Every structure is written in structure tokens, then in C-alpha cells.
Design a protein around this ligand. Sequence first.
Ligand SMILES: CN1CCC(COc2cnc(-c3cccc(Cn4nc(-c5cccc(C#N)c5)ccc4=O)c3)nc2)CC1
Length: 289
Amino acid sequence: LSALNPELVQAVQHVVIGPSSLIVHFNEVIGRGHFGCVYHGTLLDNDGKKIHCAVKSLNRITDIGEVSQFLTEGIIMKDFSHPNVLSLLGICLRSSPLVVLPYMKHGDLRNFIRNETHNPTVKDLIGFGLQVAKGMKYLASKKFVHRDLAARNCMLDEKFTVKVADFGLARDMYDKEYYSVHNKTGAKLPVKWMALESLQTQKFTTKSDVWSFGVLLWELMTRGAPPYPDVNTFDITVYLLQGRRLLQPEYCPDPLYEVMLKCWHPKAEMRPSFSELVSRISAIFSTFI
Ligand SMILES: CN1CCC(COc2cnc(-c3cccc(Cn4nc(-c5cccc(C#N)c5)ccc4=O)c3)nc2)CC1
């Protein structure tokens, strides 16, 4: 890493965590991304109080340009903050590079809602959706496009707070079943969560994140059923163009299905904003015991 531009190193210094502040348990994988496994560790604060971390080791870096990009992105991502978006705690360089993230005790949202020993109420599930909407309202306000919003890509902490995750230095494929390669460009695409226009052009916007959010709501209301199980990946674009959409789940309230449907409008500009979604979903949430 002595090949890095020294001004970049100085610019990222405030994101860097020294090895003597970290204790990582590399003997046990706690999560798996295509581009790296995740391990538990602890970060020592200024008192020596332990902060629990998920530490991710990036696995296919080959050139200093990639590292430089990673550091540049880290500076941007470090200064994001919202209670429903995952924080970047820092990067450890003097230990491959380690991305240091807050530990998420209850794992990804899709696994949480599929846990048969727990019974989230309908209200709880809608509340998870509301929390995601609030995190996305924040990302949208930063002009940041997620591109891979899905229940598998959101996390829950010890207070059951939902964090939009899988972005910035945490971006990866954490369940490879749902990504398909596009020939023309080599992009790995989460096809069954994508907006029609993104399927046609491979371009993404905040309004395509709104489409994905509608799919995530459907995931919540089905307790983690896979969307369009009988539609092959390569047939989803046509399925949508034919005027077909995911069906209303049995226990999805009518006003929430209406929200879903608006998120899947064929014209991006006609989909609700995340600000509108927070408002409307907060009303729906409030009507349940
Ligand atoms: C029973 N089980 C025992 C282990 C418990 C704690 O394990 C943890 C695992 N991972 C983290 C962690 C924290 C912050 C950031 C990330 C990275 N990241 N990962 C995912 C992710 C992780 C695992 C599976 C799937 C899928 N599909 C997706 C999504 C988005 C994202 O950004 C990981 N924290 C704790 C959970 C309950």
C-alpha cells in the first residue's frame, strides 16, 4: 500500500482503524459474500469499551487503482448517518483490507422473518418496511442510488432496528441465487427486484429503488417467499411488460398492496417518493393493534 497517492492516504486517515484498536475472530465465518466473508470482532473506543463489529475481508483485489477507489468511496460513506442505514465504522489497512461494520445481532431481514420460532405480527412486518423507507428516504436525499434493495440486503440490530445495508464498502452478492449476468456488460443483476426500465437499459435511479422497495414490501408480507418463483430470470422483463405483477399476499392489507402497485408503475416519475412512502406507510402501520 506504499504505492498509494500520499494525499489520498491523508484524506482517508480519519476512516482508518489501527490494528491495536481491533480484536477480530477470524476462526469463525458469520456471513458470506461473494467478495468476502464476514467475521465478528470488537473495536475499542476511547475508554476501551468494546463495540461489536462485523468485519469483512475483501477477496479479489488485484491492483492499487481498486484500492484507491475503495478508499475514495470510504471517505464518502463514512460521513453518511441515519438510524435506518448501516454505518461504516472504518477500514483497517495494517492487518487483505478489512471493512469494519456494526455487528447486526439478528442478521438479515429475510432470514429473520423466515425464522419459524418467532412470530412478528403483521404490524411488526409493516414496521420493518417503514424503517427501510426511512433509511431509503435518507439515501435518496444524499442522491445515492442503492441498486440492490431487497430483504436479504437489510440487517437488524439488537434493538430490532432495521438498517439498509449492502451498499458502499459492504456491497456484495450475499445470496448468489438471485443475480444473473448480462451478456452485453458483465453486470450481475438482481433481476426479480429491478424496475422495468432498469431491465431494459441497465440504468438505475432512486425511482428504480422505489420499485425494489415494493418488492421488499411483498417479501415482508409473505414472510420471505421468493418473488416470481415460476418465472425464469430471463422471462421477467416480458412478464412485467405483459401487465403482470406480484399477487397480493394473503395477509397483506389492501392499502399496502395499493402502495406496492404504485411502486411498480411503468413510468418512474409516477412512483411515490420515499418521503411519500414513509408518510403513507406510517399511517398504515398506525392502524394495527
Ligand atoms: C442465527 N444468526 C447467527 C449470526 C448472527 C449475526 O451474524 C451477523 C452476520 N453479518 C453481520 C453483518 C453486519 C453488517 C454488515 C454485514 C454485511 N452485509 N451482510 C448481509 C448478509 C449477511 C448474511 C446473510 C445474508 C443473506 N442472504 C446477507 C447483507 C447486507 C450487508 O451489508 C454483515 N452481522 C452479524 C445473525 C443470526
